[PDB]
Design a protein around this ligand. Structure first.
Ligand code: TGL
Ligand code: TGL
Ligand code: HEA
Ligand code: HEA
Ligand code: PEK
Ligand code: PGV
Ligand code: PGV
Ligand code: PGV
Ligand code: PGV
Ligand code: DMU
Ligand code: DMU
Ligand code: DMU
Ligand code: CHD
Ligand code: CUA
Ligand code: CU
Ligand code: MG
Ligand code: NA
Ligand code: OH
Ligand code: ZN
Lengths: 98, 46, 84, 259, 43, 58, 514, 79, 227
């Protein structure tokens, strides 16, 4: 038998490792470990881009297997379009503060 | 925190262009002079 | 192979402790006996000052410059031969 | 506040102290080989040991104590350790190349034969075979230690890891004794050169790997490792298997085929 | 690329000084050694 | 032995602005100062040794 | 704060800056050494002394240009600054180990300077072949100091290599495949794999040289059954990969510069460019004995190394043709950077083709250890590697500094350099075909004209170097602050401004999977 | 045939640029032949060809070093 | 030897060196063509206001870019490897001569019949006879019969050297403990010069090679006179 005596992550993980472990349990991704899935990206159904400030860099892979990524600052306000494919992105600011 | 922006993200000052000229002179000039002074050193031994 | 037992699908740790105590340490215990049997001091061979052996191109940086780091007087001749 | 999982490291003096350690050790070897003095070298070795101690202490502080080792940081350390081991494989490869070059085309100065005239190789069935059994046994015990850790078994992890360390120490003492008893030396031409430098570098790596395992032993005593998070133990196991495989290549190449 | 006008303009005269001092920092030490090679030879 | 990791986690997460290499207390500062003194003094000695080895003697 | 920032750095940008500063200083040492070479050769007779002082200068020249100028600028400097910015990463994987890679170099350089000041120096060639490099023909500390210099530089680049490979594999946005990373990032990754595999074999060889010199081993000493030629195999197993290490990050920068100043969103044939760099990296490991065609190797070995060497032309040509196809249809901006890149494409091609001449073991009997080889490698290094560096530097100076260069001054600098390097090296082909040996302080009288012209070329190059320092001073003296940069949609490194903040990508980019 | 001897002919055992082993083998063959003939009272003259071939191919300092080591009892090849 | 302002190879003295001059002419034509085509295409890409900045399909052109260079490499490899295997083909030498490298002079041994050896040193500049060549003349030349297959064996008694004669297409490294073989055949009498071609220390630049190629009967009497 195991007489035990080894801590688990549940008991002893701390700091950012613990925050990543507990968010994953609730299916949340505050530390951007997963690729977000696209919407249809129309003006009616824009890609929703979380940020902790009023702007965030978007990279748009316009078509699957494009080697060229298209990069642009997405500002709080009206949806913006990728300058190459026109896909719509909208910033959704929050804070992580708690 | 650390200084940001042009002239501040470097380990040398660019606050005064004449002091900067002196520093760059000593920096690049020391590099270029060193082989001449090692040739001298070796000729002056034997 | 020269192996032949059969996959022991128990606890991982349990199986590897089984191999540690049942195969690995017994092999070490056996090789330890084979070595504390064949380990009697053997007769040192006649010294021949072969020029491809006892190389000295620079003195060693310890001792008198002429003794190797793990010099064994019984079996390691100097370039001029055995000590006594 | 970052919203990625990666580790921004506090500004550290240990890269500079490590770089200067390398200057003192190299200029020290130079002073030892040419100017009959060990003083620079001893300072270098001392600052090197202090650098490694404080650097790896801080990595334990960052991980066990501060929680900076997210799965993403851990996956990076996995790559780093694999790439490090690959660079060590290629290092050993140069010594194997030297051995095969010298031994497959023995020159007239040797007698045009391998082993050279005047060389009496060790019996590969004596201490070299014991050394093989010792490092192979240590690969079994460390696998036991690994499985005990993952299964949450403190006492069997500690027993298996202790046994692994003990076999490492035993190999080290057997090899020191073989060095003392060997009737050939490093100055015995290309036979002594290839034998002592290849097995000598292997021996240093056994001492390094044994040291890494002892660090894991004391970290385990102090409950640092969880049943799921123990990269230092995994890195030390990979390094230990590396040391075992290099031994098997040395045993087959130098002790057996080159005898 | 677009940029602001210079914060601390460097006049033609100031450029002549920077260029002159830069070239002399390379030329004078090497010049000195090379001029005295013959003197170094005897020693 | 007993698991005292939670105590160490509390010490090394204390909001005191110290870098990790000094956050253990006064002993860190001492070991730092000894390491840097040996490195900087050793480096000065290595430069002296160069100067000495750069000129003939006997 | 100064010490914490600049001695205790864990920041990819500052460490990049330290690398560029180190490489610039090293460049000046290398340049001075090159001028001492061409002063010795600039008229028939003896200027400095016999071949010992001369070959100490030649040996140092090579080590400084390769280990202290090119690799630190390209990999340490551009690599650290650009690679994390181009993949949206907040820093390197091992930011503290990164700082040790940097701080190993000043001590490495100190050991090489000590080498040259002790005894009569290491007059070995940068190849350090025994027995000339052994303890009877090179008694004393010099060669051991050289070996230790190389051990420090080796450890630096191996740790830097682990850092880059790990960073590039592990720290991209989760949607970004390796087939969505920029060509410069590919060039650094492939370069790092070559360093990881080649430098340990160099370390093994030079360690065996050290033991032969100091512990009475005989790996390279026939008296003990050793072989000088074994050293050559171990050295060149590293030394051919080393020349691909020196150019690959240049190929990465040229891909970015040609794309940028062609006004294109992307290089022509991305996947062909990735394929070509991997193929070159692989082929660079199986060709090393083209450095050994005169040692006495069997004819079938010579036939194999001839054929395997030439094949490298195919992936290299795909890159050259793909650069031309990138220009094709561009709105060309004739920037200083673009002029460096266009000079690169042509002069690298000439240098590559003289390499192909040398690949032919039968001609190489006559061209080996002559100035034809010297012409080949200065075309690819002093024109290829250096032009990619100057192009990179001019292009990215405003990103690193936040200040603009004077473009007119930059174009003047290019024109002077272009004249000097061509006048220096082109006539070295004639010296090689007509049989002037390498590593000579003096030459038979017939070789005078081409040596004279070559030496005059080198003084023109000196004028360009001195002017470069002034141009850098003028930019920092004037402080024209950058406002707007074109094509940020396809050059992510520019999107955080100039210079970027100390911390970038604290919040990572958003990139979705469609 | 030793009347007509110009130099050592091509030997398909040593077809390549490195001839070290050619010189060594003919040196060994000559001294083995010669040992065997004087030990069976017979005539050394039959060993002559190996003598001519090693003299042609072997550097004088190699022959002279090997001759010294045979007299010293430190020659490493089997004769 | 090389003459002032020379651009190309020394005139061939041996059938092998002639083969190399023709192979070099062929390879040089390809080098000039590729380098001038690349320079021309650069100028063509940069001399139009016409633009095409949208994505370009690469599949078709990459076929051309790999197959044409592959064929060109084959067109170089074919004659290259012919000459390589031609150089290696069995001759029957009439004579064997050894050269040993030293710091800093060559020694020669002609030991097919008699014990003939000598040292060959550079003539110092202050001792040249009028019209003699600075750094090239030796005291004792390497006298050899013309129009005959000679086996040269090269080694060293110290560090690496390399024994070269450009007009005969010869360069053979001199390695201590090793005996390298090359074959020499001069179509012509004369004086054929070369220089040490592996860095070997203080006087690397100052240990040249002079072959003196003469009719067999002059070679035979010279040999007898040198005993
Ligand atoms: C507060 C306590 C401080 C005490 C300790 C430190 C003293 C600090 C002073 C006082 C501190 C208070 C604040 C003062 C700010 C700076 C003062 C200044 O203008 O003083 C100048 C400073 C800084 O020094 C340097 O930076 C050296 C370069 C000098 C300027 C050249 C400009 C080059 C521009 C062109 C390059 C383009 C590429 C960049 C383009 C990228 C742009 C972003 O001096 C030093 O104190 C040098 C200390 C070393 C730090 C690391 C430098 C990296 C070494 C480079 C490798 C050399 C290879 C030799 C190899 C060795 C072989 C032997
Ligand atoms: C600034 C540099 C210094 C200037 C030096 C210029 C040279 C002027 C000298 C007096 C000139 C008179 C004759 C002109 C021919 C000169 C060049 C040439 O044909 O070279 C001659 C050969 C050897 O060939 C020979 O065997 C001699 C051929 C002569 C035949 C013509 C009729 C005979 C009269 C010539 C006199 C000798 C005849 C006797 C000899 C008989 C046989 C040996 O040398 C080589 O192999 C060099 C290999 C270099 C490889 C680089 C590849 C090309 C890059 C640039 C291409 C694009 C252009 C932009 C170019 C951009 C730059 C890269
Ligand atoms: C950046 C450094 C660098 C690079 C990239 C190269 C690239 C090449 N090198 Fe070079 N080389 C050196 C640096 C470099 N070299 C150094 C420093 C030495 C000397 C070491 C010493 O002794 O100190 C040397 C020595 C050297 C030798 C030894 C010669 C001797 O000592 O006798 C040889 C022999 O094969 C060689 C060949 C080549 C070849 C075939 C390439 C190829 O990679 C080139 C391929 C490129 C092209 C061909 C041009 C572009 C292609 C096209 C436009 C397609 C069409 C072309 C064809 C169909 C041919 N090199
Ligand atoms: C990168 C490698 C490199 C570079 C750039 C050079 C550049 C030069 N080299 Fe050299 N050279 C070698 C590597 C290089 N060399 C090697 C490996 C050997 C063989 C060594 C051996 O035989 O053992 C050699 C040999 C060699 C010889 C033969 C010596 C002999 O055989 O006796 C000669 C002779 O003319 C020569 C000359 C020159 C000259 C005049 C330059 C000039 O073109 C230099 C001009 C100046 C520069 C190109 C500027 C450099 C500075 C920067 C680029 C930094 C600034 C950057 C920023 C601010 C970011 N070199
Ligand atoms: C089980 C082993 C125990 C631990 C080792 C013990 C002592 C120090 C050894 C260090 C390990 C290094 C290995 C390679 C170096 C040299 C050979 C060492 C192997 C050894 O210890 O061999 C001994 C020789 O030691 C000698 O020369 C003396 C050697 C001491 C001098 C130090 C050598 C300095 C070499 C510098 C290494 C630089 C490489 C760095 C690579 C960095 C990567 C870039 C053998 O003894 P012997 O009397 O000849 O023969 C036996 C006869 N009874
Ligand atoms: C492109 C390469 C593909 C093929 C690789 C194959 C590898 C090994 C082949 C060896 C097989 C030959 C063995 C029997 C015959 C004897 C060989 C021999 O003799 O080879 C000798 C030594 O080779 C030696 O050590 C050989 C040493 C090996 C050098 C290979 C380098 C690779 C090292 C890196 C590999 C990393 C892998 C990581 C490990 C997991 C050298 O030749 P000589 O005798 O000096 O000849 C001289 C003349 O007299 C001939 O006339
Ligand atoms: C002559 C003098 C020579 C030198 C003498 C001896 C030198 C070295 C002794 C051996 C090395 C000891 C290394 C100790 C490392 C301790 C830190 C550690 O292991 O750190 C771990 C990360 O791994 C990491 O950095 C992994 C770090 C990997 C370290 C690699 C070790 C190899 C070093 C060998 C040196 C090369 C020399 C080669 C000679 C040619 C921490 O993460 P975890 O373990 O997941 O903990 C977290 C959990 O608690 C959370 O719940
Ligand atoms: C033998 C030697 C031969 C001499 C050759 C001289 C070499 C170089 C000539 C330099 C001429 C610069 C080229 C054109 C202008 C660029 C740089 C410049 O001198 O100043 C320009 C404007 O002057 C402004 O207003 C700023 C006003 C401040 C004036 C200070 C500058 C002095 C003028 C330059 C003359 C230098 C001569 C010195 C000779 C030693 C700045 O750059 P822009 O024009 O804004 O272009 C970039 C834009 O896209 C940015 O938005
Ligand atoms: C002859 C004498 C020559 C002397 C030269 C010696 C040079 C220097 C001596 C000083 C070195 C000792 C100091 C310890 C260094 C430990 C490095 C390490 O362990 O680095 C780790 C990365 O490399 C990894 O994992 C894995 C990589 C582990 C590397 C360990 C150190 C190896 C040093 C020698 C390298 C030999 C190369 C192999 C072939 C010869 C950790 O990365 P950091 O960026 O710190 O932290 C990141 C944080 O997230 C951690 O919380
Ligand atoms: C050099 C000396 C030899 C040392 C060899 C070290 C090999 C290290 C590879 C580890 O591979 C092992 O394969 C075992 C297969 O035997 C498995 O064990 C266990 O896994 C199962 C469940 O986890 C148990 O039920 C099984 O009984 C048990 O074998 C286990 O996946 C794994 O560790
Ligand atoms: C490799 C690139 C470098 C080569 C090109 C450099 C040209 C250098 C410019 C001149 O440098 C100076 O030249 C003076 C002579 O013109 C020297 O003075 C010397 O000559 C004068 C007149 O003879 C005396 O007044 C001085 O005292 C005496 O030191 C002086 O020392 C030296 O600094
Ligand atoms: C901050 C700490 C870092 C700075 C430490 C600086 C220490 C400087 C100590 C003095 O230096 C030398 O150390 C060696 C000590 O053993 C001696 O070598 C010696 O080597 C041989 C004896 O082993 C003698 O014959 C030589 O004469 C002798 O120089 C030498 O004399 C002694 O002066
Ligand atoms: C003290 C501790 C029990 C309490 C706890 O787990 O902290 C036990 C568990 C495992 C034990 C160790 C293991 O049994 C392995 C070793 C066995 C040797 O006989 C003594 C030392 C040895 C290294 C032991 C020391 C000590 O008794 C340990 C460390
Ligand atoms: Cu002998 Cu160069
Ligand atoms: Cu190569
Ligand atoms: Mg050579
Ligand atoms: Na000269
Ligand atoms: O090359
Ligand atoms: Zn898009």
């Amino acid at each position: 038998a195991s007489g035990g005596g080894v801590p688990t992550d549940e008991e002893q993980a701390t700091g950012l490792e613990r925050e990543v472990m507990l968010a994953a349990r609730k299916g949340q991704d505050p530390y951007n470990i997963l690729a977000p899935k696209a919407t249809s990206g129309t003006k009616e159904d824009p890609n929703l881009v979380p940020s902790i400030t009023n702007k965030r860099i978007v990279g748009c892979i316009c078509e699957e297997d494009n080697s060229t990524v298209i990069w642009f600052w997405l500002h709080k306000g009206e949806a913006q379009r990728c300058p190459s494919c026109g896909t719509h992105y909208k910033l959704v600011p929050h804070q992580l503060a708690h | 925190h650390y200084e940001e922006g042009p002239g501040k993200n470097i380990p040398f000052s660019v606050e005064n262009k004449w002091r900067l000229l002196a520093m760059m002179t000593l920096f690049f000039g020391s590099g270029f002079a060193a082989p001449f002074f090692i040739v001298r050193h070796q000729l002056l031994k034997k | 192979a020269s192996a032949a037992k059969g996959d022991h699908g128990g606890t991982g740790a349990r199986t590897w402790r089984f191999l540690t105590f049942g195969l690995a340490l017994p092999s070490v215990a056996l090789c330890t006996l084979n070595s504390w049997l064949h380990s009697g001091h053997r007769e040192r061979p006649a010294f021949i000052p072969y020029h491809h052996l006892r190389i000295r191109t620079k003195p060693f940086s310890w001792g008198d410059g002429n003794h190797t780091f793990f010099h064994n007087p019984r079996v390691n001749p100097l370039p001029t031969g055995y000590e006594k | 506040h970052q919203t990625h999982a990666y580790h921004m490291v506090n500004p550290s003096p240990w890269p500079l102290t490590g770089a200067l350690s390398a200057l003192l050790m190299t200029s020290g070897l130079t002073m030892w080989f040419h100017f009959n003095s060990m003083t620079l070298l001893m300072i270098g070795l001392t600052t090197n040991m202090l650098t490694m101690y404080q650097w790896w202490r801080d990595v334990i502080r960052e991980s066990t104590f501060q929680g900076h080792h997210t799965p993403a940081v851990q996956k990076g350390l996995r790559y780093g350790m694999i790439l490090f081991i690959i660079s060590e494989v290629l290092f050993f490869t140069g010594f194997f190349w030297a051995f095969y070059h010298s031994s497959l085309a023995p020159t007239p100065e040797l007698g045009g034969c391998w082993p050279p005239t005047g060389i009496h190789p060790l019996n590969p069935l004596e201490v070299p075979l014991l050394n093989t059994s010792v490092l192979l046994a240590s690969g079994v015990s460390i696998t036991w230690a690994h499985h005990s850790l993952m299964e949450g078994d403190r006492k069997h992890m500690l027993q298996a890891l202790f046994i692994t360390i003990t076999l490492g120490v035993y190999f080290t003492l057997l090899q020191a004794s073989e060095y003392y008893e060997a009737p050939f030396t490093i100055s015995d031409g290309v036979y002594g050169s290839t034998f002592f430098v290849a097995t000598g570098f292997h021996g240093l790596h056994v001492i390094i790997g044994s040291t890494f395992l002892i660090v894991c032993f004391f970290r385990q005593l102090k409950f640092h490792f969880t049943s799921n998070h123990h990269f230092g133990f995994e890195a030390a196991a990979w390094y230990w298997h590396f040391v075992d495989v290099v031994w098997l290549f040395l045993y087959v190449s130098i002790y057996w085929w080159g005898s | 690329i677009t940029a602001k006008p210079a914060k601390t303009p460097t006049s033609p005269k100031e450029q002549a000084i920077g260029l002159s001092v830069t070239f002399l920092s390379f030329l004078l030490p090497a010049g000195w050694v090379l001029y005295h090679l013959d003197n170094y030879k005897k020693s | 032995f007993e698991n005292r990791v939670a105590e160490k986690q509390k010490l090394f997460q204390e909001d005191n602005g110290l870098p990790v290499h000094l956050k253990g207390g006064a002993t860190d500062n001492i070991l730092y100062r000894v390491t840097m003194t040996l490195c900087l003094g050793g480096t000065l000695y290595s430069l002296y040794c160069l100067g000495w080895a750069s000129f003939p003697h006997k | 704060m100064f010490i914490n920032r600049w001695l205790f750095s864990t920041n990819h940008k500052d460490i990049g800056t330290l690398y560029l500063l180190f490489g610039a200083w090293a460049g000046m040492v290398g340049t001075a050494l090159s001028l001492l070479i061409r002063a010795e050769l600039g008229q028939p007779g003896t200027l400095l002394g016999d071949d010992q002082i001369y070959n100490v200068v030649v040996t140092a020249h090579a080590f400084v240009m390769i280990f202290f100028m090119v690799m630190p600028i390209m990999i340490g400097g551009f690599g650290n600054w650009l690679v994390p910015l181009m993949i949206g990463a907040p820093d390197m994987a091992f930011p503290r180990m990164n700082n040790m890679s940097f701080w190993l170099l000043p001590p490495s350089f100190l050991l090489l300077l000590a080498s040259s000041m002790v005894e009569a120096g290491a007059g070995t060639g940068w190849t350090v072949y025994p027995p000339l490099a052994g303890n009877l023909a090179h008694a004393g500390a010099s060669v051991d100091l050289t070996i230790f210099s190389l051990h420090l530089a080796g450890v630096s680049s191996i740790l830097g290599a682990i850092n880059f490979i790990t960073t590039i594999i592990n720290m991209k946005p989760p949607a970004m495949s390796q087939y969505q990373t920029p060509l410069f990032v590919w060039s650094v990754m492939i370069t790092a794999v070559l360093l990881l595999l080649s430098l340990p074999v160099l370390a093994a060889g030079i360690t065996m040289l050290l033991t032969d010199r100091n512990l009475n081993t005989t790996f390279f000493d026939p008296a003990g059954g050793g072989d000088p030629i074994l050293y050559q195999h171990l050295f060149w197993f590293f030394g051919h990969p080393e020349v691909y290490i020196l150019i690959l990050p240049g190929f990465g920068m040229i891909s970015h510069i040609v794309t940028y100043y062609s006004g294109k969103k992307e290089p022509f044939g991305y996947m062909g460019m990735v394929w070509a760099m991997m193929s070159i990296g692989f082929l660079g490991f199986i060709v090393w004995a083209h450095h050994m065609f005169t040692v006495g190797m069997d004819v079938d070995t010579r036939a194999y190394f001839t054929s395997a060497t030439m094949i490298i032309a195919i992936p290299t040509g795909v890159k050259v043709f793909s650069w031309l196809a990138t220009l094709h249809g561009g709105n060309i901006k004739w920037s200083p950077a673009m002029m460096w890149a266009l000079g690169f494409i042509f002069l690298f091609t000439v240098g590559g083709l003289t390499g192909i001449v040398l690949a032919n073991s039968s001609l190489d009997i006559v061209l080996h250890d002559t100035y034809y080889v010297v012409a080949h490698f200065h075309y690819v290094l002093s024109m290829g590697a250096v032009f990619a560096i100057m192009g990179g530097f001019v292009h990215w100076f405003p990103l690193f500094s936040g200040y603009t260069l004077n473009d007119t001054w930059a174009k003047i600098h290019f024109a002077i350099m272009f004249v000097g390097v061509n006048m220096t090296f082109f006539p070295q082909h004639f010296l090689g075909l007509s049989g002037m040996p390498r590593r000579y302080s003096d030459y038979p009288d017939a070789y005078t004209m081409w040596n004279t012209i070559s030496s005059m070329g080198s003084f023109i190059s000196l004028t360009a170097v001195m002017l470069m320092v002034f141009i850098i001073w003028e930019a920092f003296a004037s402080k024209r602050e950058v406002l707007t940069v074109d094509l940020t949609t396809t050059n992510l490194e520019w999107l955080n401004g100039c210079p970027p903040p100390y911390h970038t990508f604290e919040e990572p980019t958003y990139v979705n999977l469609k | 045939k030793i009347k007509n001897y110009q130099t050592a002919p091509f030997d398909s055992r040593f077809p390549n640029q490195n001839q070290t082993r050619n010189c060594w083998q003919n040196y060994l063959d000559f001294h083995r032949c010669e040992k065997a003939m004087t030990a069976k009272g017979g005539d050394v003259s039959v060993c002559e060809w190996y003598r001519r071939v090693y003299k042609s191919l072997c550097p004088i300092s190699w022959v002279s070093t090997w001759d010294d080591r045979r007299a010293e009892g430190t020659f490493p090849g089997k004769i | 030897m090389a003459y002032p302002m020379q651009l190309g190879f020394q005139d061939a003295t041996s059938p092998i060196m002639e083969e190399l001059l023709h192979f070099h002419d062929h390879t040089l034509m390809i080098v000039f063509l590729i380098s001038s085509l690349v320079l021309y295409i650069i100028s063509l890409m940069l001399t139009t206001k016409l633009t095409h900045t949208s994505t370009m399909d690469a599949q078709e052109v990459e076929t051309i870019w790999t197959i044409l260079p592959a064929i060109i490499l084959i067109l170089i490899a074919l004659p290259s490897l012919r000459i390589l295997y031609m150089m290696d083909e069995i001759n029957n030498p009439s004579l064997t001569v050894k050269t040993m490298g030293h710091q800093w002079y060559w020694s020669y041994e002609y030991t097919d019949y008699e014990d003939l050896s000598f040292d060959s040193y550079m003539i110092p500049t202050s001792e040249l006879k009028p019209g003699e060549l600075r750094l090239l003349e030796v005291d004792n030349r390497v006298v050899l019969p013309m129009e005959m297959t000679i086996r040269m064996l090269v080694s060293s008694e110290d560090v690496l050297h390399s024994w070269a004669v450009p007009s005969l297409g010869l360069k053979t490294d001199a390695i201590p403990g090793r005996l390298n073989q090359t074959t020499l055949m001069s179509s012509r009498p004369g004086l054929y010069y070369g220089q040490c071609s592996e860095i070997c220390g203080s006087n690397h630049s100052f240990m040249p090679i002079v072959l003196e190629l003469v009719p067999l009967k002059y070679f035979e009497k010279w040999s007898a006179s040198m005993l």
